[PDB]
Design a protein around this ligand. Sequence first.
Ligand SMILES: *[C@H](C)[C@H]1/C(=C/c2[nH]c(/C=C3N=C(/C=C4\NC(=O)C(CC)=C4C)C(C)=C\3CCC(=O)O)c(CCC(=O)O)c2C)NC(=O)[C@@H]1C
Ligand SMILES: *[C@H](C)[C@H]1/C(=C/c2[nH]c(/C=C3N=C(/C=C4\NC(=O)C(CC)=C4C)C(C)=C\3CCC(=O)O)c(CCC(=O)O)c2C)NC(=O)[C@@H]1C
Ligand SMILES: *[C@H](C)[C@H]1/C(=C/c2[nH]c(/C=C3N=C(/C=C4\NC(=O)C(CC)=C4C)C(C)=C\3CCC(=O)O)c(CCC(=O)O)c2C)NC(=O)[C@@H]1C
Ligand SMILES: *[C@H](C)[C@H]1/C(=C/c2[nH]c(/C=C3N=C(/C=C4\NC(=O)C(CC)=C4C)C(C)=C\3CCC(=O)O)c(CCC(=O)O)c2C)NC(=O)[C@@H]1C
Ligand SMILES: *[C@H](C)[C@H]1/C(=C/c2[nH]c(/C=C3N=C(/C=C4\NC(=O)C(CC)=C4C)C(C)=C\3CCC(=O)O)c(CCC(=O)O)c2C)NC(=O)[C@@H]1C
Ligand SMILES: *[C@H](C)[C@H]1/C(=C/c2[nH]c(/C=C3N=C(/C=C4\NC(=O)C(CC)=C4C)C(C)=C\3CCC(=O)O)c(CCC(=O)O)c2C)NC(=O)[C@@H]1C
Ligand SMILES: *[C@H](C)[C@H]1/C(=C/c2[nH]c(/C=C3N=C(/C=C4\NC(=O)C(CC)=C4C)C(C)=C\3CCC(=O)O)c(CCC(=O)O)c2C)NC(=O)[C@@H]1C
Ligand SMILES: *[C@H](C)[C@H]1/C(=C/c2[nH]c(/C=C3N=C(/C=C4\NC(=O)C(CC)=C4C)C(C)=C\3CCC(=O)O)c(CCC(=O)O)c2C)NC(=O)[C@@H]1C
Ligand SMILES: *[C@H](C)[C@H]1/C(=C/c2[nH]c(/C=C3N=C(/C=C4\NC(=O)C(CC)=C4C)C(C)=C\3CCC(=O)O)c(CCC(=O)O)c2C)NC(=O)[C@@H]1C
Lengths: 159, 159, 158, 160, 65, 144, 160, 158, 161, 158, 159
Amino acid sequence: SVLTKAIVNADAEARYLSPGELDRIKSFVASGERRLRIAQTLTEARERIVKQAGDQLFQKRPDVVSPGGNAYGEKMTALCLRDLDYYLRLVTYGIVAGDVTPIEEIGIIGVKEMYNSLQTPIPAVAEGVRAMKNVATSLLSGDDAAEAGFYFDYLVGAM
Amino acid sequence: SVLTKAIVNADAEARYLSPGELDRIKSFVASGERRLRIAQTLTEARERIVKQAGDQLFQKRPDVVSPGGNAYGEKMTALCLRDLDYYLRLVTYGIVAGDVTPIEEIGIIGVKEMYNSLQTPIPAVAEGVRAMKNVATSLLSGDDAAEAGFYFDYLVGAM
Amino acid sequence: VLTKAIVNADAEARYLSPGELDRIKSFVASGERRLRIAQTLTEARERIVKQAGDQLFQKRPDVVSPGGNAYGEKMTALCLRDLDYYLRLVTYGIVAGDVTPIEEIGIIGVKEMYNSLQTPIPAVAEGVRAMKNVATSLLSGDDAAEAGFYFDYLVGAM
Amino acid sequence: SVLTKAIVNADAEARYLSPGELDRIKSFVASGERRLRIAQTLTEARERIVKQAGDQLFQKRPDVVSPGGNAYGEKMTALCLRDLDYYLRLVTYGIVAGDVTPIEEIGIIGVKEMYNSLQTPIPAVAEGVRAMKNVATSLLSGDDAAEAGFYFDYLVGAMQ
Amino acid sequence: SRYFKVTACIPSLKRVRTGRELQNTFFTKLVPYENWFTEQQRIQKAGGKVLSVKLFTGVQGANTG
Amino acid sequence: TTLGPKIFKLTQNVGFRSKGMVQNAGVVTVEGSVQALITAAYQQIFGRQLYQGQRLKVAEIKLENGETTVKEFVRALGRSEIFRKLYWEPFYVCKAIEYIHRRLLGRPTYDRVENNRYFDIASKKGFYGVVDAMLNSNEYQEVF
Amino acid sequence: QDAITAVINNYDVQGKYLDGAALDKLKAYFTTGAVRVRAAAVISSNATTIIKEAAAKALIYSDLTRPGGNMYTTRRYAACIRDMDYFLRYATYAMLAGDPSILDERVLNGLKETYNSLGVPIAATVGGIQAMKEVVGGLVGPDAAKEASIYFDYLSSGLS
Amino acid sequence: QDAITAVINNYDVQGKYLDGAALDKLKAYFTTGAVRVRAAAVISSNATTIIKEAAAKALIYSDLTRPGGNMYTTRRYAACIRDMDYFLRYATYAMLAGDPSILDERVLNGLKETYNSLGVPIAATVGGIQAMKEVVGGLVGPDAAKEASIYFDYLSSG
Amino acid sequence: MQDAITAVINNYDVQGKYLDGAALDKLKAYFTTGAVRVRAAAVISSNATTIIKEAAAKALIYSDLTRPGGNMYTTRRYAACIRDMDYFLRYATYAMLAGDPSILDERVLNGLKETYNSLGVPIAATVGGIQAMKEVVGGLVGPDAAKEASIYFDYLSSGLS
Amino acid sequence: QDAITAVINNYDVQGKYLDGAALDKLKAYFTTGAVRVRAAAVISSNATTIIKEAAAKALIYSDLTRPGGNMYTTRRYAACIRDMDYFLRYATYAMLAGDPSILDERVLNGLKETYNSLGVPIAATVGGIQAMKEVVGGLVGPDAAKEASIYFDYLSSG
Amino acid sequence: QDAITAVINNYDVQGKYLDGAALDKLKAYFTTGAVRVRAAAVISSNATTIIKEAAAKALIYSDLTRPGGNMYTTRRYAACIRDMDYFLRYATYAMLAGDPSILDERVLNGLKETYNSLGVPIAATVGGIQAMKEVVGGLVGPDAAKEASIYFDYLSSGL
Ligand SMILES: *[C@H](C)[C@H]1/C(=C/c2[nH]c(/C=C3N=C(/C=C4\NC(=O)C(CC)=C4C)C(C)=C\3CCC(=O)O)c(CCC(=O)O)c2C)NC(=O)[C@@H]1C
Ligand SMILES: *[C@H](C)[C@H]1/C(=C/c2[nH]c(/C=C3N=C(/C=C4\NC(=O)C(CC)=C4C)C(C)=C\3CCC(=O)O)c(CCC(=O)O)c2C)NC(=O)[C@@H]1C
Ligand SMILES: *[C@H](C)[C@H]1/C(=C/c2[nH]c(/C=C3N=C(/C=C4\NC(=O)C(CC)=C4C)C(C)=C\3CCC(=O)O)c(CCC(=O)O)c2C)NC(=O)[C@@H]1C
Ligand SMILES: *[C@H](C)[C@H]1/C(=C/c2[nH]c(/C=C3N=C(/C=C4\NC(=O)C(CC)=C4C)C(C)=C\3CCC(=O)O)c(CCC(=O)O)c2C)NC(=O)[C@@H]1C
Ligand SMILES: *[C@H](C)[C@H]1/C(=C/c2[nH]c(/C=C3N=C(/C=C4\NC(=O)C(CC)=C4C)C(C)=C\3CCC(=O)O)c(CCC(=O)O)c2C)NC(=O)[C@@H]1C
Ligand SMILES: *[C@H](C)[C@H]1/C(=C/c2[nH]c(/C=C3N=C(/C=C4\NC(=O)C(CC)=C4C)C(C)=C\3CCC(=O)O)c(CCC(=O)O)c2C)NC(=O)[C@@H]1C
Ligand SMILES: *[C@H](C)[C@H]1/C(=C/c2[nH]c(/C=C3N=C(/C=C4\NC(=O)C(CC)=C4C)C(C)=C\3CCC(=O)O)c(CCC(=O)O)c2C)NC(=O)[C@@H]1C
Ligand SMILES: *[C@H](C)[C@H]1/C(=C/c2[nH]c(/C=C3N=C(/C=C4\NC(=O)C(CC)=C4C)C(C)=C\3CCC(=O)O)c(CCC(=O)O)c2C)NC(=O)[C@@H]1C
Ligand SMILES: *[C@H](C)[C@H]1/C(=C/c2[nH]c(/C=C3N=C(/C=C4\NC(=O)C(CC)=C4C)C(C)=C\3CCC(=O)O)c(CCC(=O)O)c2C)NC(=O)[C@@H]1C
C-alpha cells in the first residue's frame, strides 16, 4: 500500500515521515472511497471480463490453443483462464491499496521463472492482461478507467 | 522535488515509474497551482514574518539576547534575523517543490556542525522557526496553513 | 584446451604442471581426428539442418502457425538460418576441443536476444536436439559421442 | 583430489560441472590405474627407500647425528627415520589423489612451526626428502619417476 | 549524484607478491562524491600517490542536488 | 589452502584491454573470469543467485568495462533495494546487523563494541549508514 | 504490514475477491487516516521534547540516574534515550499503518532477551514508554490519543 | 534534476526569494505535467515493443547483424538492445522531469568515448534512437510527442 | 567436502597405515565406475530444467500446494520451491561424481530440517519431489548410472525425513 | 616520516654510516622534542576553538559565506570546517614528528587536484590556514610558535 | 588467445565454415606444438638459473644494486627478480599458445605507466629481458630458440 511504501522508505533513512510523504498519504485516504467503488465494479464484472479477454487472446494467438501450444486442451485452457482470473483479482487488490506492492509480491516476483518451468509463453500472458484491460476499461467510467489502466499497464510491463 | 524523488527511486530499481508513483505525480501537478499561491503569500509577508518571529523568540528566550548569549549585540541580532530569513526562503522553495529535498540540501545537512562552530544553540534556532510558523499560519488560510506547517515542522525536526 | 590450461596456471602464478602439459600433448594429437569429424558434419551440414528443422516442426505445429514466430517463408528461413548458425558453432567447438568458442558466439545474451525477437527458447533447444540426432546417425559411434557432448552443452545452455 | 577440486569450483559458481571440468575428471579416472601401480611400487620399496635415504642424509649432514645434533642417539635417530617414513607415506597418498592437497594438509601446513619448537633443522629434513626422491626414482620407470618426482619436489619446495 | 574519476598508483612496500598486482597498483576508478573522501585517505595511508582527480558527473558547486 | 573456501580476485580488466589484433574476435575469452566473479558476488552477498527482474545489470556493466572495481560493485549490492528488502526490513534491528555483518565482512561480530558501533550508526542514519560503515571499515580494506 | 494490506492478505489466502464486508473495514481505516497523518506530524516535530518530558517524568531524578543505577554514566544515559527514540519512531509508524505488526517484527522481537543479557530493567523501560504515551496524548489531542495509546500499550505489553 | 529544482537553484545562487516571473515558469511546467505522466505510462507499457519496432526499422536485416558487423554474435546483439532500453528509460525520466540534465549525468557522459573505443558505430546508434522516437511519437499522441521528441533529439545530439 | 578416493586415504591416514591391497581394491572399484558417472552427470546437467518440470508435474503442481493457501501458492513461493529442487538435483549430481555422500551433509543437509520447520515448508512434500526427481533421472541416465544416482537421492530424502 | 628517520634515510642513500654531524642534527631534535609535546597537548585541547577563531578571522562575514559563495549552504560550510580540522590535526602530527613529509604524503597529496575540480578557492583556504597559525601561535607560546609556524607555512605553500 | 582460436575467429567474422586451407594452418601449429612443449619444460626446470644468469649479465655488480640505485635494498632487489620471473613465465605461456596476445593483455598493458610512476628504469629492464632471451636460447636449443625469441622480443618492444 501507499502507506507501507512510505514507512519503509522512512525506516531505511531512519527518519520520521517527510511532509511530502505525509501529503501523499492524505491524498490517498481521500481517494480511497472512490477506489473502493472502482474495485467493486470490476469484481462484479469479473466473470465476463475474463471470458471476453480469453476469447480475444485466443483470436490474437491461435498458436497457444493449438496441439503444439501450451494452452491447448480443456484442462490447459481452464488453467490459462484461471491465471487470467488470478491477475484480475490482483489488480483489484492493487487499486484499493493504491500501490502495486501487493500485486508485486503475489504475482510479479519469480513470475518469469515459474512460467519458464511451465513453458508458458510470457508475451501471450501479457496479451491476455492487455485484453482484460480493454474489457475492463469499457465497463469503467473514463476517469475510473485511467486509474485501473495504470495497474493493468504495470502488470503488462512486469511480464 | 517530489518528481526528483520518484525518478531517483525508479532509477535505483532500474525500472519505469510505478503506477502508484505516477499517481502521486499527478496529484502533485494538480496541487501545484495552489502551492504557488501559498508560496507567493509568504514571500510578500516575508519581512514582517521574520520581524515578528524574532521578537517572539527573544521574549521566549531572554538568554540568547544576553551578554553571554550568541544573539546578543546588534551585529549578532542581525545575523540571527538573517538566518530566520534564510529558513523562510527555504520553506517557500519546499512548498513549490512539494518535497523537503530542496530545503534539505541547502539547510539541513551539516546544520548541526555549522551551528556548533558558531556556538549558536540549535534549540533556540528551532524556536525561531516555530515562531515564524505561527506568524505565517495567521496570514495563511487554514488549509494553506496546514501545507505550510508541514514544511515548517520539518525544519524544526531537522534542527 | 591450451588456453584453459594457461589460464589456470596464471591464476596459480605457476609454470604449467606436467599433467597439464601432458593434456596439451594429447589434445594436439587428437586434433587431426577432431578435424575429420568436423569435416564430415560440414559436408552433411545442409541436409542435417533441413532434416532437423522439419523434424522439430512435426513435434510442435504451433511454432510454424499464423500466430507463431516461425510462420511464413521469411520467418521459416530465419529459423533455419539460426539452426545452421548453431551447427557451424558446434563444428568450431569440436576442432577447438572446448565449448568456449561456441559459448562466446552463441550462448551469452542468447536469452535476451530471443526474448526481444519473441522466439520461444525451448523450441530452439528442441531444434538443437533434433540436429544432434541427425548428426549422430551420420557419425560413427565414438565420433558421435564426442559430437554429442558439444550438442548437449548447447541444449543445456539455452 | 582432482574430483574434489572440480566440484568445489562448480559449487562456488553455483553451476553444474562444465564440459572442460568433466573432461579433466575423465582423464583422471583413466590415469588412476597407472597411478595406483606407481604408489604400490613405492609402498613395497618403502623400507629400503627410507633406509638408503637416511644413510645419504647422515653422510650429507654429519652434524645432525652428532652429540650436539638433534638426531643423535638411537631414540632420536629412530624418530628422524620415522619422519622420513611419514613423508613417503604422504607422497604415495598424493600420487593416488593426483593432487598435493592430501600431502599438504597432513604435512606441509604448520610444519615450520612444529619443527621450530622441536628445534629440528628444516633444511636437513628437506635434504632427506631429496634423498628419498633419488632412491625412489631409481626403482621407478622413467615416466613413473617423473610423476613421482613432482610430488617429491613439492615437499622439498614446501620445506625450507 | 556527483561522481569522481580518479587515477592513482599504489606501491606494495610491506611485502612482495608473486601474483600480478598491476590492477591493484595502477587503477582508474569512478567514485561517488561522498566515497571519494574516504578513498582518498585510503590511498594516502597506503602511501600511494593520486595522479589525477576529475569530477566525472555533476556541476561545479551546484547549490542543491 | 584447501582447508579454506575459494577466494575470487579480479586479476584483469578486459574493457581497457582492447585487443590489439582481431578486434572483432567473437571468441574473445577471459569474459568468463569476470562473469564468474559476478556470479560469486551474488553468492556471497545474497547467498543465492537472484531472480530475473532482481539482478542489477548497471553495476555489472561498469565492472565488465573496468569503470568500477570489485570494491565498488560490492558497494552497489549492499546499497541495493533488494538487499534491504531481504535482510534489513523483516528483522529486529540487531538481528539484521548481525546477518549483514556476516555477509559483508565474512565473520560474526567479535564483541559488544562492534555491535554497539553499528547500532548507534543505524539509529542516526538507518540501513544505509550501517552498510556504508561496514564497507568503509579499515578491517574491510585490509582483508579484501 | 498495514491495515489495508492485512485485509488484502487475508483475502488472498482465501483466494476470495474483495467483498463489501472487507470494503467496510478498509473504509473504516480511510476515515481514521486523516487524523493519524495529523498526529504523526505533531509527534515528529515534538519528538525531542516528548522524550525529554517522559524522561523527566520517570527516568531522571531517580535511583537509575544516581551512581549504581542502570542509567548512571553518560554512555548508559545516552543508550537509554536512544532506545526511547526508537520506541517513539516505531509507534508513530504503527499509528500511520494502523497495524501493530511492525512493532513485533522490528522492536518487540528479541528485545526481552537483549535486555536480560544487558541487565537493563524491563519495568523501568515500560514505565518510560507509558510516560511517553501520556506526553504524546496531550500533544496529539483526544481523538488521535486513543489511536496513539494502543500502540504504546502494545509495546509495553510486549516488553512485559 | 528537474524543472522545478532548476528554477529554485538559479534563485538560490542569487539568494532571491521566488518571484512571480519564476512562478510563471513553474506554472507552465505544472500544466504540461499531466500530459507527461500519461505519456510516461504509455511508454513503460509498450517499451519492449518500441524497442522491437525500432530495431526492425534500423538494426536488424542489416550488415550489423551479418557476420563481421558490430551487432553480430548473440552477446553483441544483446548489448545493443540493452543500450536501446537504457536510452528509452532515461528519455522517459527526462520527459517527466522536464529537464535534459539527467540525460547528461547518466547516459550522455563518456558515452562517445566508450563507443569510440568499442568501435560501436555512432551514426547507426543515432539512427536507432531516431527510430525509437518515431515509434514513441505514435503511441504517446501529438501533444506528448513534441515533449518526448526533444529528449530523444538531445540524446542523438549527444 | 570428501570424495571416495580421499575417504580411503583419510581412513588409512588415521590408522597411519600405508595403502594396502584391500584399500587399493576400493580405489580400483571407484575408477571403473568413474567413466559411467561422468556420462550420467552430463546427461543430468543438460536435462536439468526438464527433470525439475517433470518432477513438479508428478507431485507439486495441480495440487493444494499450488492452490491459494498452499505453501507453493504465489509466484514468489513457486519460484523458491523450484529453486530448492534445482539445488537438490545439482548437489546429488556432485555427490554422484564424488562417489561420497559427505558433500550433501556439509552443504545441503545441515540445518535444512530446522530451516524448513521455521519456514513452514512441508517436509513430506519436499521428500516426495526428491523421489520424483530420482525416478525421472533414472530414466535419462540409464540403468547402470541409475543405481548410483538413486543412492544420493535417497540420502537426501532420508536426511530431510 | 620523522626527523630521525629522515636523517637515517639520507645517510642510507649515500650508504654512509651515521656520523657526528648527523648525530648533532638528531641531538638538536631531541632537545626540541619536549617543547613540541607540550605544544601538541595545548593544540588538541583547544582545537575546536582554534578552528572557530580562524573561521571568524577569515571565512565568515565574507562573500564565501554569502549566497553564491563557495562556503554558502550548511553542507559546504560543514565541509570547509571539517577540512580546517584536518589541516590542524596533520600540522600537529608534523610538529611532533619534526618533519614536513607527512604533510606531503597525506594532506598535500591529491587535495590541490580535488580543490581545482571542485572549484574551491586555494587562496581562501590558504588564508584560513594562516589564520589558524596565528591563533595557534598565541596558545602554544613563543618557543613552540616558531616550530608550529613552519608546518602551517608548508601547508599554505603547498 | 591461441593459434587455433585465431584461425577460428578469422573464419567466424567471414561466417565461413572451416576449410582445408584453414585446416592446413591448424595442422602447421599442431606440428610445432610438440617442440614447444619440450621447450616449455626446459624453461620451467631452469627458470631460477635463467634469471640468475640474466641478472649477473645486466642487473648485478651495477649502480642499480649500489646504494641510491633502483634495485638497492632487499625489498627492491626481490621485486626486480620477481618481475624477471613474470616475464619468463608469460613468455613461456605465449610460446605454448603460439600467440603474442596474452603478453599484451597481461604483461604489456599499463607496464610503462606503472614503471614511470615507480621510477623503475625501462631500458635496464629491457636489457634484462634480452639477457634472459639469450640464456633461454641456449637451453631450449636452435629450433625452439627461434620460437622463444619472438615472444621475448615482443615483450622488449612493448616495454
Ligand atoms: C494463459 C493466459 C496462458 C497460460 C497459462 C497456464 N498456466 C498453467 C499453469 C499454472 N499457472 C500458474 C500460475 C500461477 N500460480 C500462482 O500462484 C499465480 C499468481 C497468484 C499464478 C499466475 C500455476 C501455479 C500453474 C501450475 C499448475 C497449477 O495450477 O497448479 C498452465 C497449464 C500447466 C502447464 O503449463 O503445463 C497454463 C496453460 N498458458 C498459455 O500459453 C496462455 C498464454
Ligand atoms: C537566530 C535564530 C539564532 C542565532 C543566529 C546566528 N547566526 C550567526 C552566524 C551565522 N549563521 C549562519 C547561517 C547560515 N549559513 C548558511 O549557509 C545557512 C543556510 C542557508 C544558514 C542558516 C552563518 C553562515 C553564519 C556565519 C556568519 C555569516 O553570516 O557569514 C550568528 C553570529 C555568529 C556568532 O554567534 O558568533 C548568530 C547569532 N543565534 C542565536 O542564538 C539565535 C537563536
Ligand atoms: C528457429 C530454431 C527458431 C526461430 C528463429 C528466428 N530467428 C529470427 C531472427 C534472428 N535470429 C537471430 C539469431 C542469431 N544471430 C546471431 O548472431 C546468432 C549466433 C551466431 C544467432 C543464433 C538474429 C540476430 C535474428 C535477427 C535477424 C537478423 O539476423 O538480421 C527470426 C525472425 C524474427 C524477426 O523479428 O526477424 C526467427 C523466426 N524462430 C522460431 O520460432 C524457431 C523456434
Ligand atoms: C628488474 C628487471 C627491474 C626493476 C623492477 C622493479 N619492479 C618494482 C615494482 C613493481 N613492478 C611491477 C611490475 C609488475 N607487476 C605485474 O603484475 C606485472 C605484469 C605481470 C609486472 C611486470 C609492479 C606492479 C610493481 C609495484 C608493486 C609490486 O611489488 O609488484 C620494483 C620496486 C620499486 C618500488 O620502489 O616499488 C622494482 C625494483 N627495477 C630495477 O631496478 C630493474 C631494472
Ligand atoms: C553545570 C556545569 C551546567 C548545567 C548542568 C545541569 N545538569 C543538569 C542535569 C543533569 N546532568 C546530568 C549529568 C550527569 N549524570 C551522570 O551520570 C554524569 C557523569 C557521571 C553526568 C555529567 C544528569 C544525569 C542530569 C539529570 C538529573 C538527574 O541525574 O537526575 C541540569 C538540570 C536539567 C534538568 O532539567 O534536570 C543542569 C542545569 N547546566 C548548565 O547550563 C551549566 C553550564
Ligand atoms: C531506557 C528507557 C532504559 C535503558 C536502556 C538501555 N539500553 C541499553 C543498551 C541497549 N539497548 C539496546 C536495544 C535495542 N536493540 C535493538 O535492536 C532495539 C530495537 C530496534 C532496541 C530497543 C541495545 C542493542 C543495547 C546494547 C548496546 C551495547 O552493546 O552497549 C543500555 C546500555 C546498557 C549498557 O550496559 O551499555 C541502557 C541503559 N536503561 C534503563 O535503565 C532505562 C529503563
Ligand atoms: C545498439 C543501438 C548499437 C550498439 C550497441 C552496443 N553497445 C555495446 C557496448 C556498450 N555500450 C555501452 C553503453 C552504455 N552503458 C551504460 O551504462 C549506458 C548508459 C546507462 C550506456 C548507453 C557500454 C558501456 C558498453 C560496453 C560493453 C558492455 O557490454 O557493457 C556493444 C558491444 C560492443 C563489444 O564489441 O563488446 C554494442 C553492440 N552497437 C551497434 O551495433 C548498434 C548500432
Ligand atoms: C575550507 C577552508 C575551504 C573549503 C573546503 C571544502 N572542501 C570540500 C570538499 C572536499 N575536500 C576534500 C579534500 C580534503 N579535505 C581534507 O581535509 C583532506 C585530507 C587532508 C582532503 C583530501 C575532498 C576529498 C572533498 C570532496 C569529498 C567530500 O566532501 O566528501 C568542499 C565541498 C565542495 C562542494 O560541496 O562542492 C568545501 C567547501 N571551501 C571553502 O569555501 C573554503 C575556502
Ligand atoms: C657474507 C656474510 C656471505 C656472502 C655474501 C655475498 N653477497 C654477495 C652478493 C651480494 N650481496 C648483496 C646483498 C645486499 N644488497 C642489498 O641491498 C642488501 C641490503 C642492504 C644486501 C645485504 C647483493 C645485492 C649482492 C650482489 C652484488 C652487488 O651488490 O652488486 C656475494 C657474491 C656472490 C656472487 O659472486 O655472485 C657474496 C659472497 N656469501 C657467503 O657465502 C657469506 C656467508
